[PDB]
Ligand binder design. Structure first.
Ligand SMILES: [Mg+2]
Ligand SMILES: [Mg+2]
Ligand SMILES: [Mg+2]
Ligand SMILES: [Mg+2]
Ligand SMILES: [Mg+2]
Ligand SMILES: [Mg+2]
Ligand SMILES: [Mg+2]
Ligand SMILES: [Mg+2]
Ligand SMILES: [Mg+2]
Ligand SMILES: [Mg+2]
Ligand SMILES: [Mg+2]
Ligand SMILES: [Mg+2]
Ligand SMILES: [Mg+2]
Ligand SMILES: [Mg+2]
Ligand SMILES: [Mg+2]
Ligand SMILES: [Mg+2]
Ligand SMILES: [Mg+2]
Ligand SMILES: [Mg+2]
Ligand SMILES: [Mg+2]
Ligand SMILES: [Mg+2]
Ligand SMILES: [Mg+2]
Ligand SMILES: [Mg+2]
Ligand SMILES: [Mg+2]
Ligand SMILES: [Mg+2]
Ligand SMILES: [Mg+2]
Ligand SMILES: [Mg+2]
Ligand SMILES: [Mg+2]
Ligand SMILES: [Mg+2]
Ligand SMILES: [Mg+2]
Ligand SMILES: [Mg+2]
Ligand SMILES: [Mg+2]
Ligand SMILES: [Mg+2]
Ligand SMILES: [Mg+2]
Ligand SMILES: [Mg+2]
Ligand SMILES: [Mg+2]
Ligand SMILES: [Mg+2]
Ligand SMILES: [Mg+2]
Ligand SMILES: [Mg+2]
Ligand SMILES: [Mg+2]
Ligand SMILES: [Mg+2]
Ligand SMILES: [Mg+2]
Ligand SMILES: [Mg+2]
Ligand SMILES: [Mg+2]
Ligand SMILES: [Mg+2]
Ligand SMILES: [Mg+2]
Ligand SMILES: [Mg+2]
Ligand SMILES: [Mg+2]
Ligand SMILES: [Mg+2]
Ligand SMILES: [Mg+2]
Ligand SMILES: [Mg+2]
Ligand SMILES: [Mg+2]
Ligand SMILES: [Mg+2]
Ligand SMILES: [Mg+2]
Ligand SMILES: [Mg+2]
Ligand SMILES: [Mg+2]
Ligand SMILES: [Mg+2]
Ligand SMILES: [Mg+2]
Ligand SMILES: [Mg+2]
Ligand SMILES: [Mg+2]
Ligand SMILES: [Mg+2]
Ligand SMILES: [Mg+2]
Ligand SMILES: [Mg+2]
Ligand SMILES: [Mg+2]
Ligand SMILES: [Mg+2]
Ligand SMILES: [Mg+2]
Ligand SMILES: [Mg+2]
Ligand SMILES: [Mg+2]
Ligand SMILES: [Mg+2]
Ligand SMILES: [Mg+2]
Ligand SMILES: [Mg+2]
Ligand SMILES: [Mg+2]
Ligand SMILES: [Mg+2]
Ligand SMILES: [Mg+2]
Ligand SMILES: [Mg+2]
Ligand SMILES: [Mg+2]
Ligand SMILES: [Mg+2]
Ligand SMILES: [Mg+2]
Ligand SMILES: [Mg+2]
Ligand SMILES: [Mg+2]
Ligand SMILES: [Mg+2]
Ligand SMILES: [Mg+2]
Ligand SMILES: [Mg+2]
Ligand SMILES: [Mg+2]
Ligand SMILES: [Mg+2]
Ligand SMILES: [Mg+2]
Ligand SMILES: [Mg+2]
Ligand SMILES: [Mg+2]
Ligand SMILES: [Mg+2]
Ligand SMILES: [Mg+2]
Ligand SMILES: [Mg+2]
Ligand SMILES: [Mg+2]
Ligand SMILES: [Mg+2]
Ligand SMILES: [Mg+2]
Ligand SMILES: [Mg+2]
Ligand SMILES: [Mg+2]
Ligand SMILES: [Mg+2]
Ligand SMILES: [Mg+2]
Ligand SMILES: [Mg+2]
Ligand SMILES: [Mg+2]
Ligand SMILES: [Mg+2]
Ligand SMILES: [Mg+2]
Ligand SMILES: [Mg+2]
Ligand SMILES: [Mg+2]
Ligand SMILES: [Mg+2]
Ligand SMILES: [Mg+2]
Ligand SMILES: [Mg+2]
Ligand SMILES: [Mg+2]
Ligand SMILES: [Mg+2]
Ligand SMILES: [Mg+2]
Ligand SMILES: [Mg+2]
Ligand SMILES: [Mg+2]
Ligand SMILES: [Mg+2]
Ligand SMILES: [Mg+2]
Ligand SMILES: [Mg+2]
Ligand SMILES: [Mg+2]
Ligand SMILES: [Mg+2]
Ligand SMILES: [Mg+2]
Ligand SMILES: [Mg+2]
Ligand SMILES: [Mg+2]
Ligand SMILES: [Mg+2]
Ligand SMILES: [Mg+2]
Ligand SMILES: [Mg+2]
Ligand SMILES: [Mg+2]
Ligand SMILES: [Mg+2]
Ligand SMILES: [Mg+2]
Ligand SMILES: [Mg+2]
Ligand SMILES: [Mg+2]
Ligand SMILES: [Mg+2]
Ligand SMILES: [Mg+2]
Ligand SMILES: [Mg+2]
Ligand SMILES: [Mg+2]
Ligand SMILES: [Mg+2]
Ligand SMILES: [Mg+2]
Ligand SMILES: [Mg+2]
Ligand SMILES: [Mg+2]
Ligand SMILES: [Mg+2]
Ligand SMILES: [Mg+2]
Ligand SMILES: [Mg+2]
Ligand SMILES: [Mg+2]
Ligand SMILES: [Mg+2]
Ligand SMILES: [Mg+2]
Ligand SMILES: [Mg+2]
Ligand SMILES: [Mg+2]
Ligand SMILES: [Mg+2]
Ligand SMILES: [Mg+2]
Ligand SMILES: [Mg+2]
Ligand SMILES: [Mg+2]
Ligand SMILES: [Mg+2]
Ligand SMILES: [Mg+2]
Ligand SMILES: [Mg+2]
Ligand SMILES: [Mg+2]
Ligand SMILES: [Mg+2]
Ligand SMILES: [Mg+2]
Ligand SMILES: [Mg+2]
Ligand SMILES: [Mg+2]
Ligand SMILES: [Mg+2]
Ligand SMILES: [Mg+2]
Ligand SMILES: [Mg+2]
Ligand SMILES: [Mg+2]
Ligand SMILES: [Mg+2]
Ligand SMILES: [Mg+2]
Ligand SMILES: [Mg+2]
Ligand SMILES: [Mg+2]
Ligand SMILES: [Mg+2]
Ligand SMILES: [Mg+2]
Ligand SMILES: [Mg+2]
Ligand SMILES: [Mg+2]
Ligand SMILES: [Mg+2]
Ligand SMILES: [Mg+2]
Ligand SMILES: [Mg+2]
Ligand SMILES: [Mg+2]
Ligand SMILES: [Mg+2]
Ligand SMILES: [Mg+2]
Ligand SMILES: [Mg+2]
Ligand SMILES: [Mg+2]
Ligand SMILES: [Mg+2]
Ligand SMILES: [Mg+2]
Ligand SMILES: [Mg+2]
Ligand SMILES: [Mg+2]
Lengths: 64, 149, 116, 202
RNA sequence: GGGGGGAACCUGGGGAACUGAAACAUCUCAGUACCCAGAGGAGAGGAAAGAGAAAUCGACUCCCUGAGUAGCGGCGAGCGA
RNA sequence: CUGUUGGGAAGCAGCGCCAGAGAGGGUGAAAGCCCCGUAGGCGAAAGGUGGGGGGAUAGGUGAGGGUACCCGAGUACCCCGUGGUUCGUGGAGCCAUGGGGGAAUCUGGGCGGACCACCGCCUAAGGCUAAGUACUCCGGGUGACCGAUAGCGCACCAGUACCGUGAGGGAAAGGUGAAAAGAACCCCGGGAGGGGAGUGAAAUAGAGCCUGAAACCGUGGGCUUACAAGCAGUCACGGCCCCGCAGGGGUUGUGGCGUGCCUAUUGAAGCAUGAGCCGGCGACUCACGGUCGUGGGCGAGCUUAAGCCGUUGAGGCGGAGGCGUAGGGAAACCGAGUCCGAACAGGGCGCAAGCGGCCGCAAAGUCCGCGGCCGUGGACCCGAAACCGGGC
RNA sequence: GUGGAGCCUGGGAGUGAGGGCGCGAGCGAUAACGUCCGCGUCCGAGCGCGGGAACAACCGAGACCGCCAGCUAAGGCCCCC
RNA sequence: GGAUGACCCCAGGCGGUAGGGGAGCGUUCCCGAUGCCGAUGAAGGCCGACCCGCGAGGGCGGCUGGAGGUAAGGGAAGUGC
RNA sequence: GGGCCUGACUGCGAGGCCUGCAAGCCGAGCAGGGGCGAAAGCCGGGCCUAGUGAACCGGUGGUCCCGUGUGGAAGGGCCAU
């Protein structure tokens, strides 16, 4: 049968133009009050995943 | 050029790897699975694309971004599509949506919008909208933009 | 379609067994006991060819020595005469000489006796 | 651009045709593979251990019998039981690209012409559906059947006398195919047959 | 007129567990296996109190596509128009 | 048709003919022309079918006004408990209904995802309806389907013998030859059996019957063996035996060397696993989907699915749809940029894309074939203890 | 320094029980064919071969095939040899 | 070297378990076949001290057997104990 | 120890340490609006290395991005906690 896309993956990750995988930096969902402004802000930026894990994630989104 | 001349090109039909067939062959006995463990067993190994030993999987430690939407459907609404200027060089005369579709340029059922990467050939073009800077290269290169509906 | 066994098996078995006539018990009669004996034979061969070189050497040298005794010197000097002089007759040959050419051998003893 | 020896009911001729300059044998092979593939039955079938007539029942207790552990006699390792990866009925047919099938038909004829063993004919003289007639027509035609003939025309009359002969493969013209061309030695087509074939490579 | 039978196939009334989730309880297996009723050469459905954004289509059934899309989901495993 | 070889022509030879029939199968072996057929045509008094054609009947068919009589009740609808849906209480509608409350009859009512307004779509609480769809007990057709440990459990008097109180389980077992010509009669024998004889092409085709392997048992022959220590072999030399005419083959006296196979393990000759021996079955696959590679086709394009037509081992059609040509952003939205931002800082994710004089050449991409892998299925094969269901 | 070196990108893996030895330490008892690290090596996979009586890892030495040729290594040169 | 793997000269590498890559042998079936071998003997079986191949093998000869077998080149797998 | 103050910032971030992943760590410089100082300048908490908890579900404050035919609204998103 058709493979199914991992919905959890499609909700967390993005495939870029050139193949990279992209996600949101972890560690500002809570416990924020004491975290530095430098910390709090750097956790905005999307980050690129390291290839072996990115590549694995990729196989989970067959249709994109 | 008869029947015993019909013959596939050099390796466009490889033979197949045949494990389980004696020593010399290279993969007999274990038949390439090495020795024991889950991954030997007739069955797997669980999904190598996400299972991480029982650990919290490297995917699911990552957060979730933005609207996932919810029941009942997706909102249906005006979908667009980008066709450039560098594309319309392959025409002369007027250019319309449905035309552009047939050209193998436009995905049908999306409202064409013209965006200008390139050079505007003296033309009349009919888009559902124009990227502000396609309007530019196009007008002043002697052409006529038709914002249609 | 069914590619059944049919004849292949009987033919390798008939093979290895014929490779093994002369053997004791089922080493000549059972396929797998023949097959097993033949693994043995194989390496006993490959070893024993490499062995038989050195084997003969030993034979000759023991004769050679026995000859140089008969003219009052040991093998191990006689082969330093022959050396430092210049004679390069190998010992298949020395052993041959010394058996069936006593005088012709005696010469060499002498030139070896000398070359010291 | 090729010269087809047209057989005129008044002597002879030569035709332009204009076929591929270039023979690709691998494409020929690909197009023939497809043909005999798609035309298989796929009717071999065996029963799997779970499709056999036997009882699902353990044949003696696991431990302590002294014999080896067994499930039920449905199992492949027992004489009787289902076979392992059996043939199961399937569909070898596939959808070879349309272009590739065209260039096949182009190349095939193109080769037969290039060898001289093609021949376009206008209509068949003394032959109204009666073997010995055709047989004798073919005689005046330049084929005594020491070489095989692929023969094309929509004309049940002609190809009817022309059936039954060893050296003749009959065809209608919409049914021109590349196995059949290569299959034979000598193509003797025909003019509307020729236009259906020409209506094709376009 | 009914009653009983009939390889599957169909509709209805009921309806599991192993298994999956590398444990497990919501979830999965699955409205599956199976019991029972009934109908037939098929069976069910069927002439809009429909659909759902086209100021549009126009009974039902079945096929391909839509689409593993929209979504559903201890937002897990998976499920899925 | 004739000749020839052969037990036997259908082989081989000479000379011919038919083909809308050179599919197939038989006949003492290999037959277009001997047999059964094949192509092509022909056929129903009776029974059944009869969706095509013919006929007949039930059946059907106007416009404006007025009135406000009718338009499916314990129903809508609202609330509580569930179910169905992709929808697991969710913003939770819709359709179905167990319990309570309970209408209206076109200025009626249900829906368009809480609800309200608007703007729409439809007429619920009565019933019937062909076709296109599913199946295969049966009958026909066809196999890059099996050939008696296979294929159905069953080629055979098999759901049998047998096993079980029962539900239930469930076998083995095909072949003489062309033709029974199935061995008269004779002799040893109580017979079984055999020896002559007789048939046959063949009788080590003799019914325990084609072929007739291997383990296993025997008779005969050559070498060898009773002071010898062994994973049974190997190397070397010699003897005797056979084939032959400086060469071989067989056997083994003496010497040298030498710790079975498999498996599992740090490590096994191992006193760790399995195997009495032979034979025959016995384990990495298939489909759909991914991702690479690969041989080809086409190239800013590539490609059809289901189906329609054609052929019955002929291919064609069909552009619905799919991937590709633009990205960035949760999104609106913008676009060679876009996002974050007050920034026209700076960053993140993007765009710059191959060689000559339009062509070529090569390809981005896509389609098919093949090969390696992955995901879904039992997914390399045998294996539980158990769980659940209906029955006995 | 041209090597079965290295770097870049992809395809397929197996492994994630190691053991002995030398040296440096912890643990143990200045015990263990003991345990745990570190640096090396060899066995694993070189139970192929010479030495060590025999004998995975100690010394010699990395076995493509053949030779009734030659030099050597460790270790040996009184007989077994 | 020469001229597009024709074959010669030279130098070098070639222990190997898990495992990766390569090149081949054979079995059943299909196109090749309306063909071709075959009772002057098919497949199968039993010998061989001969021939080719590194090898899996393939030839060739004798006995047995008594009606089948099937090439060059390709294809497909219920393919090797 | 004293005076003044709140940079215990907002928007970013070249280049690194570290590392299997995911995290952790350091940081000049530009812009906005500031603190202290006459000035050069220094301030994005604390002499430094511990005082911590990924996702998921939900709360609250803003933003006013989506809003299931339209206007809203229910509910979601982004930012902060
Ligand atoms: Mg994203
Ligand atoms: Mg959290
Ligand atoms: Mg938050
Ligand atoms: Mg898609
Ligand atoms: Mg894309
Ligand atoms: Mg293949
Ligand atoms: Mg291979
Ligand atoms: Mg091998
Ligand atoms: Mg390999
Ligand atoms: Mg190996
Ligand atoms: Mg084995
Ligand atoms: Mg492997
Ligand atoms: Mg594997
Ligand atoms: Mg094992
Ligand atoms: Mg292990
Ligand atoms: Mg493993
Ligand atoms: Mg498993
Ligand atoms: Mg979404
Ligand atoms: Mg067969
Ligand atoms: Mg087999
Ligand atoms: Mg024998
Ligand atoms: Mg012997
Ligand atoms: Mg040796
Ligand atoms: Mg030596
Ligand atoms: Mg010397
Ligand atoms: Mg059964
Ligand atoms: Mg049964
Ligand atoms: Mg069963
Ligand atoms: Mg049971
Ligand atoms: Mg037991
Ligand atoms: Mg036992
Ligand atoms: Mg089991
Ligand atoms: Mg059985
Ligand atoms: Mg069976
Ligand atoms: Mg395929
Ligand atoms: Mg014919
Ligand atoms: Mg025919
Ligand atoms: Mg022919
Ligand atoms: Mg039901
Ligand atoms: Mg129950
Ligand atoms: Mg479980
Ligand atoms: Mg448990
Ligand atoms: Mg438990
Ligand atoms: Mg479900
Ligand atoms: Mg009934
Ligand atoms: Mg029907
Ligand atoms: Mg019906
Ligand atoms: Mg109605
Ligand atoms: Mg949610
Ligand atoms: Mg005669
Ligand atoms: Mg005759
Ligand atoms: Mg003849
Ligand atoms: Mg015919
Ligand atoms: Mg013949
Ligand atoms: Mg015949
Ligand atoms: Mg007929
Ligand atoms: Mg009224
Ligand atoms: Mg309710
Ligand atoms: Mg529900
Ligand atoms: Mg619900
Ligand atoms: Mg829940
Ligand atoms: Mg709901
Ligand atoms: Mg409503
Ligand atoms: Mg109710
Ligand atoms: Mg109701
Ligand atoms: Mg009302
Ligand atoms: Mg309602
Ligand atoms: Mg309602
Ligand atoms: Mg509606
Ligand atoms: Mg609404
Ligand atoms: Mg409606
Ligand atoms: Mg009504
Ligand atoms: Mg009604
Ligand atoms: Mg009805
Ligand atoms: Mg009905
Ligand atoms: Mg119907
Ligand atoms: Mg079926
Ligand atoms: Mg057959
Ligand atoms: Mg049977
Ligand atoms: Mg048999
Ligand atoms: Mg049976
Ligand atoms: Mg039967
Ligand atoms: Mg009984
Ligand atoms: Mg009984
Ligand atoms: Mg009879
Ligand atoms: Mg008596
Ligand atoms: Mg008698
Ligand atoms: Mg007698
Ligand atoms: Mg008798
Ligand atoms: Mg015989
Ligand atoms: Mg016989
Ligand atoms: Mg018998
Ligand atoms: Mg017979
Ligand atoms: Mg017999
Ligand atoms: Mg017998
Ligand atoms: Mg004897
Ligand atoms: Mg004696
Ligand atoms: Mg004594
Ligand atoms: Mg004696
Ligand atoms: Mg001893
Ligand atoms: Mg001898
Ligand atoms: Mg000996
Ligand atoms: Mg020796
Ligand atoms: Mg020994
Ligand atoms: Mg072995
Ligand atoms: Mg073990
Ligand atoms: Mg152990
Ligand atoms: Mg152990
Ligand atoms: Mg190991
Ligand atoms: Mg023992
Ligand atoms: Mg054990
Ligand atoms: Mg043992
Ligand atoms: Mg074992
Ligand atoms: Mg026993
Ligand atoms: Mg066996
Ligand atoms: Mg595989
Ligand atoms: Mg299959
Ligand atoms: Mg693939
Ligand atoms: Mg071009
Ligand atoms: Mg096309
Ligand atoms: Mg997007
Ligand atoms: Mg903004
Ligand atoms: Mg930028
Ligand atoms: Mg090209
Ligand atoms: Mg390409
Ligand atoms: Mg993979
Ligand atoms: Mg299993
Ligand atoms: Mg229980
Ligand atoms: Mg019960
Ligand atoms: Mg290397
Ligand atoms: Mg290397
Ligand atoms: Mg490296
Ligand atoms: Mg592989
Ligand atoms: Mg470990
Ligand atoms: Mg350890
Ligand atoms: Mg260690
Ligand atoms: Mg180590
Ligand atoms: Mg070590
Ligand atoms: Mg230890
Ligand atoms: Mg120690
Ligand atoms: Mg120690
Ligand atoms: Mg070894
Ligand atoms: Mg090593
Ligand atoms: Mg060693
Ligand atoms: Mg040992
Ligand atoms: Mg040693
Ligand atoms: Mg030693
Ligand atoms: Mg020396
Ligand atoms: Mg020394
Ligand atoms: Mg060499
Ligand atoms: Mg070497
Ligand atoms: Mg090697
Ligand atoms: Mg055969
Ligand atoms: Mg044929
Ligand atoms: Mg034949
Ligand atoms: Mg002949
Ligand atoms: Mg005869
Ligand atoms: Mg004969
Ligand atoms: Mg024979
Ligand atoms: Mg026959
Ligand atoms: Mg053949
Ligand atoms: Mg072949
Ligand atoms: Mg098999
Ligand atoms: Mg202060
Ligand atoms: Mg501040
Ligand atoms: Mg940086
Ligand atoms: Mg990092
Ligand atoms: Mg500033
Ligand atoms: Mg300042
Ligand atoms: Mg100041
Ligand atoms: Mg200042
Ligand atoms: Mg600063
Ligand atoms: Mg969770
Ligand atoms: Mg949340
Ligand atoms: Mg809000
Ligand atoms: Mg709005
Ligand atoms: Mg709205
Ligand atoms: Mg709100
Ligand atoms: Mg912020």
């Amino acid at each position: 049968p058709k493979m199914k896309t991992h919905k959890g993956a499609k909700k967390r990750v993005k495939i870029t133009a050139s193949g990279k995988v992209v996600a949101m930096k972890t560690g500002k969902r809570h416990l924020n009050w004491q975290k530095s402004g430098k910390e709090i802000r750097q956790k905005g930026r999307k980050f690129v995943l390291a290839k072996p894990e990115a590549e694995r994630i990729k196989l989970l989104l067959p249709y994109e | 050029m008869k029947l015993s001349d019909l013959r596939p090109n050099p390796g466009a039909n490889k033979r197949r790897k045949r494990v389980g067939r004696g020593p010399g062959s290279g993969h007999g006995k274990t038949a390439t699975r090495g020795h024991k463990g889950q991954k030997s067993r007739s069955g797997g190994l669980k999904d190598p694309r996400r299972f991480e030993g029982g650990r919290s999987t490297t995917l699911m430690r990552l957060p979730k971004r933005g609207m996932q939407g919810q029941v009942p459907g997706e909102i249906k609404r005006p979908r667009y599509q980008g066709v450039n200027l560098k594309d319309l060089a392959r025409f002369e005369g007027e250019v319309t949506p449905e035309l552009l579709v047939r050209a193998g340029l436009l995905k049908k059922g999306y409202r064409l919008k013209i965006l200008g990467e390139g050079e505007a050939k003296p033309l009349k073009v009919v888009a559902h909208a124009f990227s502000k800077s396609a309007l530019e290269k196009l007008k002043a290169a002697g052409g006529e933009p038709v914002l249609l509906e | 379609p069914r590619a059944k066994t049919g004849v292949v098996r009987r033919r390798k078995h008939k093979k290895i067994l014929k490779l093994a006539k002369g053997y004791w018990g089922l080493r000549s009669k059972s396929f797998r006991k023949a097959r097993e004996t033949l693994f043995a034979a194989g390496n006993y061969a490959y070893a024993h060819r490499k062995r038989r070189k050195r084997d003969f050497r030993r034979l000759w040298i023991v004769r050679i020595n026995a000859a140089c005794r008969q003219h009052g010197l040991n093998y191990s000097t006689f082969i330093h005469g022959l050396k430092k002089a210049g004679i390069e007759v190998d010992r298949k040959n020395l052993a041959d000489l010394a058996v069936r050419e006593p005088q012709v051998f005696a010469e060499l003893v002498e030139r070896a006796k000398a070359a010291q | 651009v090729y010269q087809i020896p047209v057989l005129s009911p008044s002597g002879r001729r030569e035709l332009a045709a204009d076929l591929p300059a270039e023979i690709n044998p691998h494409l020929l092979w690909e197009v023939v593979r497809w043909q005999l593939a798609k035309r298989r039955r796929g009717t071999a079938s065996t029963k799997t251990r779970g499709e056999v007539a036997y009882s699902g029942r353990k044949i003696w207790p696991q431990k302590h019998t002294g014999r080896a552990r067994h499930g039920d006699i449905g199992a492949p390792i027992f004489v009787g039981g289902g076979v392992v990866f059996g043939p199961k009925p399937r569909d070898y047919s596939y959808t070879l690209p349309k272009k590739v099938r065209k260039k096949g038909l182009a190349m095939a004829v193109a080769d037969r012409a290039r060898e001289g063993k093609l021949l376009l004919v206008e209509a068949f003289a003394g032959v109204n559906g009666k073997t010995k007639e055709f047989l004798a027509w073919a005689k005046e035609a330049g084929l005594d059947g020491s070489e095989s003939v692929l023969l094309v025309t929509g004309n049940e009359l002609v190809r009817r006398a022309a059936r039954n002969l060893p050296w003749v493969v009959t065809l209608a013209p919409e049914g021109l195919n590349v196995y059949d061309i290569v299959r034979t030695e000598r193509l003797v087509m025909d003019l509307d047959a020729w236009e259906v074939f020409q209506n094709r490579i376009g």
